[PDB]
Amino acid sequence: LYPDSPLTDQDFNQLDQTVIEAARRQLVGRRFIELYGPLGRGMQSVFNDIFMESHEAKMDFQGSFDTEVESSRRVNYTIPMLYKDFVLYWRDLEQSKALDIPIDFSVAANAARDVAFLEDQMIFHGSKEFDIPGLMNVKGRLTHLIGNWYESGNAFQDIVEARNKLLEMNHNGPYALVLSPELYSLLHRVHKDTNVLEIEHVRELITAGVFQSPVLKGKSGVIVNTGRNNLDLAISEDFETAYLGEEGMNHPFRVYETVVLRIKRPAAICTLIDPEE
């Protein structure tokens, strides 16, 4: 199912294996955000409705004569492209063909790492040339400051006060926590007079997973609830490769992906900024 290439089609889909097999090992952004289906090639813009206000239901009687809905405030986005290119040499592809050694694609698996980490910055800190807001840069994001995370047991104390600022604005249900690698090492201490690990003492309250990503700074952390209606990862193409021709004498390639992060209800995110100042 490929027109022309210096590879067998039986060999070409081995390259599509190892470019996604070493991609899902690295990705942490897609771990708790139900994204979308595909969108096809003919869609270069997406719309998201920043609600910024929500309230409860009503239970009175046989009905009413109006539709009390929230505001919409429609904003237009554009879809970037994240890519990285690798080169696959002649005279090693030729040498593996003459005496029949299976070819290694361990440049390509190294290439899909960097496109899955460049993807991971725009989902946290957000882009600038397309001004797409990150997960720690939106307006109305329920900030919360803390300090001195490791003395006895106040690590577990420091987030129950954080979910209470998130529970009183009518947001509950399944939560998710993302912690920087500095904070995750401190959470593996042993709890005083509970005599269980402090990370396991908190993984039954967040109930859909704590995580650790190197995209964050030192003292930081984000708790957000999952599902749709609050977060979305509208996508247009997944990790596809593409031939680029026989320039010079070798064979280059390019992997690419087209994602955006649209945040629908920004009031259901929190931020453990944790300064000393």
């Binding site: 996604i20 897609r30 139900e34 997944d238």
Partner: peptide
Amino acid sequence: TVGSLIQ
């Protein structure tokens, strides 16, 4: 045509 979803 979806290629790589982890969850």
